[PDB]
Amino acid sequence: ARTTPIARYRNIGISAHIDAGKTTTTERILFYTGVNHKIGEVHDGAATMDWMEQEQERGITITSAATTAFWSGMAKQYEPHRINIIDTPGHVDFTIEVERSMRVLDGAVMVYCAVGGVQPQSETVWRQANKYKVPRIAFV
């Protein structure tokens, strides 16, 4: 009945400053987990997370988009864990979306630009995740 065991579930968010690479990382995650047959790119509007017309045209994520992927590993090490990822908007003008998601999620991948690193909205999502007391990993 249960397609995957309880232990093999990973509810995570991808949170960061604007244009830190959240949607691109989500697209590569979907590609390497096989659900997406083309990598696409955000600035051409081919990103799957940026499904709304405004997101496609303006190159930004305005909504928290939740999807699910199956990951075994680089070397197929593990039985397929199911990662429930949510791509959140790093805009300070959409903070309720990230707070909304981050309440329910169990982990956060905080993305940081290698050049800019910690930025204002990275600090904002940091505070939100801290008040929700969630575990974090970081992706530079």
Next chain:
RNA sequence: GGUUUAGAACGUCGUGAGACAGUUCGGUCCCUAUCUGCCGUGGGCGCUGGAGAACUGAGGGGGGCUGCUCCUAGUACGAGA
């Protein structure tokens, strides 16, 4: 085509012939280039015995325009846009 000839009519002015930075219809645009100039093209002589070819380069002319798409690069800049 307009502008200003000769015809005709409207409005207005005048008694009238006629007239109007008023309008309307119709109304003949000539020249075989001597010289200069210019574009090409040769004949004569010269360049120091004659001739055939290859050049040199003074000097002169020609040409010089620019959009859009992509990469750099969603890069620099920008809280973002």
